[PDB]
Amino acid sequence: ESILSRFDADWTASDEARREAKNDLFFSRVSQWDDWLSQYTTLQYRGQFDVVRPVVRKLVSEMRQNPIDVLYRPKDGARPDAADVLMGMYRTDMRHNTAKIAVNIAVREQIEAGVGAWRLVTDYEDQSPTSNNQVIRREPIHSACSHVIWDSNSKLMDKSDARHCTVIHSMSQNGWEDFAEKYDLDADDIPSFQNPNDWVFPWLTQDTIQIAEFYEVVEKKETAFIYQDPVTGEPVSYFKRDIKDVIDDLADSGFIKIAERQIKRRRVYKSIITCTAVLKDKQLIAGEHIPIVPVFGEWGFVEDKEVYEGVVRLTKDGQRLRNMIMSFNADIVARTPKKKPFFWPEQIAGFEHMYDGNDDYPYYLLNRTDENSGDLPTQPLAYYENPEVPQANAYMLEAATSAVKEVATLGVDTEAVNGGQVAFDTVNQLNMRADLETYVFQDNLATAMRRDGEIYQSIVNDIYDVPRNVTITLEDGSEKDVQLMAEVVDLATGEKQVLNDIRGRYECYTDVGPSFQSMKQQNRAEILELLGKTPQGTPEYQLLLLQYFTLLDGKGVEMMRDYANKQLIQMGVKKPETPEEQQWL
Amino acid sequence: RHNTAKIAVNIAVREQIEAGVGAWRLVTDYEDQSPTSNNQVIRREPIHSAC
Amino acid sequence: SHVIWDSNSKLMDKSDARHCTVIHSMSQNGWEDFAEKYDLDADDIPSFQNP
Amino acid sequence: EWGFVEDKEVYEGVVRLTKDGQRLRNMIMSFNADIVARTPKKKPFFWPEQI
Amino acid sequence: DGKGVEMMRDYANKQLIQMGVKKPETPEEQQWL
């Protein structure tokens, strides 16, 4: 079977473990806790000098300067149905605390540390009583760095990859939690793992031993519309194709274009196929959309080795001098053979009374007479203990300063229009990602069995098809003005329950560019160094009245356009949601 | 209909020294996605450095 | 100090069972606790959290 | 785009200047870091009879 | 809500108008019909 190896696809990092596969934390862990791997005759005090994170988390303030807040892109695209009140259903992104920090916690994947296992509100259908069309958005996680590695293409969101490779509610004893609340197995799985123990045992907890699973393999539906080989019995009639250009029309020999197909067919799938594995029937829902998956930082790789570049590169090197003034003091005060007076300790032989401070000052037992020394003075004034006293301290901190400020530099800017834009900030333009893309491109999951009065009330559409005349109500009575009444018009009703492709919709997405919000931010006027906008003109009075009505997010805003009916009706710019109007005078 | 095309200059286009240059790809003609009206295009990665 | 949370957490819509640990501590003359409700022999004597 | 002299197609980046000045900082730490073990805070002598 | 203020609450009623359109945040009012 050609599937003989999926073994070496994903976790192949276990094959490269000889040297580099442990360095994922070598870009991170060297800051916190232990640092020096080289042994080499050094003493204990360590770990309290680190000084890394300030530049790391100072980037949190540098994440979002541009507001990065717009959505739904108004324009004239399509048939007049749902677009008047703009969003009529979901404000729900601004509803919940975690949802408006969802973008803010989403900007925290771009530098930080490794990305871990993923979970949403324990999967699906747990909360939000609703029309099933959508629920809010996915929730990111914390920590879980060094456990797994993902290699297929694994750069940016332009890729189509095997759907939902693995998704884990990870490492808690209650952590199995509700994923077994569909149907309970033993509730326990127990794969047996391994690490470089290295026969050491300062540490105890060995437990990983949890669930890792698969979704679907190879291919799902190909479009590949085929009308061909009708004669001869359709031998090997299935085929695939790239370009449609020059074939033109063969129809002289055949029929015309009416067909339907079977998109539901068995195809052989062996997934992980662990030797001892089990049946695992029916985990999936109607194909389509499961917005679980993130995007990663963008860099080119020299080898199959992962490429990632952090700040630590310099901070792990040029900071040795900062502790050299420490590197000396520790052991020079740890040895300390109690520096002693000399040349009149010839009676130094041990006493008791002397150590107390002896407020009687003269010790007054001494002698000058010595065994023959010849002629000259002898001077034991020389070096015995001297401190560090390095002479270069002046310019060192300026060199290392220039280095650290070489690293800490991002987008040096002054004021006004210069802007705070950085590539790390540009990946926040795409941080909408999974949630919207999946149900805007693929819309099936829905309640939405309704048409023409749920199409069993369709009797309401019977009007004039009968030969004789029922129509044309008598003139302009107050009898019936009421809404939802049939007179003449026929309806095409609404779209069929979404088949995942029709355009004129896709009316709603983000406009990236100037930060201008829904109502009148930059388009109205502007923020940068200026004053006194309103110019001179007669109609610019009323056209200035049109300017500042602004927000629909308020309370009495519905009075706004309801104020437009006055002798001010002369304008004629009034086109609100109002059903009828044509009111007074 | 997407900003991802504007961002995708990424590490490729800006870089003539640290690694290989960028690239660009238009739509390979007549992918069956969205065959309705005038203009339909999206984009892909510019080619990897490869020294 | 010595209170530690192991159940599950992180979603305030209450996905899972929470309030895993709720205790009031350092009550000696604070005997008002739950003696306005039910107190008879106070026979509990558990073992918790003490290092 | 850059105009060139001879034969093969080569135009480097704008910055070749990183080599020279940046070698010598590693030299500064090198001449010491080699001799740091060779000046390890050692003993005075010879009136001491410690031996 | 102030000390002696009817005015910062809606006092409008008729004010300067022609007829018929207020429909306020406050009750029916409409002194003379």
UniProtKB/Swiss-Prot annotation, chain A:
Q: Which residues form the signal peptide?
A: none
> Would you kindly state one Gene Ontology biological process term found in this protein's UniProt entry?
viral DNA genome packaging
Highest taxon listed in the record's lineage: Viruses
Question: What's in the keyword line of the UniProt record?
Answer: Capsid protein, Late protein, Viral capsid assembly, Viral genome ejection through host cell envelope, Viral genome packaging, Viral penetration into host cytoplasm, Viral release from host cell, Viral short tail ejection system, Virion, Virus entry into host cell
Name the GO cellular-component terms.
viral portal complex
Q: Lyase: is it a keyword of this entry?
A: no
Main subcellular location = virion
What does this chain do?
Forms the portal vertex of the capsid. This portal plays critical roles in head assembly, genome packaging, neck/tail attachment, and genome ejection. Procapsid assembly may initiate with a nucleation complex composed of portal and scaffolding proteins. The portal protein multimerizes as a single ring-shaped homododecamer arranged around a central channel. Switches upon genome packaging from an asymmetrical conformation in the procapsid (PC-portal) to a symmetrical ring in the mature capsid (MV-portal). This change of conformation may serve as a signal for headful packaging.
**The family this protein is said to belong to:** Belongs to the p22likevirus portal protein family.
Complexes and interactors: Homododecamer. Interacts with the terminase large subunit; this interaction allows the packaging of viral DNA. Interacts (via C-terminus) with the head-to-tail adapter protein gp4; this interaction participates in the head completion. Interacts with the scaffolding protein; this interaction initiates procapsid assembly, thereby ensuring incorporation of only one portal ring per capsid. Interacts with the capsid protein.
This chain belongs to the protein called: Portal protein
Which organism is this protein's natural source?
Salmonella phage P22 (Bacteriophage P22)
- This protein's encoding gene: 1
Which part of the complete sequence is present?
Answer: 9 to 593 of 725
Swiss-Prot record, chain B:
Kindly list the places in or outside the cell where this protein is found, as annotated in its UniProt entry: Virion
Lineage: superkingdom? Viruses
Q: Which family does it belong to?
A: Belongs to the p22likevirus portal protein family.
Describe its assembly.
Answer: Homododecamer. Interacts with the terminase large subunit; this interaction allows the packaging of viral DNA. Interacts (via C-terminus) with the head-to-tail adapter protein gp4; this interaction participates in the head completion. Interacts with the scaffolding protein; this interaction initiates procapsid assembly, thereby ensuring incorporation of only one portal ring per capsid. Interacts with the capsid protein.
Please describe what this protein does: Forms the portal vertex of the capsid. This portal plays critical roles in head assembly, genome packaging, neck/tail attachment, and genome ejection. Procapsid assembly may initiate with a nucleation complex composed of portal and scaffolding proteins. The portal protein multimerizes as a single ring-shaped homododecamer arranged around a central channel. Switches upon genome packaging from an asymmetrical conformation in the procapsid (PC-portal) to a symmetrical ring in the mature capsid (MV-portal). This change of conformation may serve as a signal for headful packaging.
Q: What is this protein called?
A: Portal protein
Which species?
Salmonella phage P22 (Bacteriophage P22)
Read off the lineage from the record.
Answer: Viruses, Duplodnaviria, Heunggongvirae, Uroviricota, Caudoviricetes
Q: Please indicate which part of the intact protein appears here, giving the first and last residue numbers and the full length.
A: 103 to 153 of 725
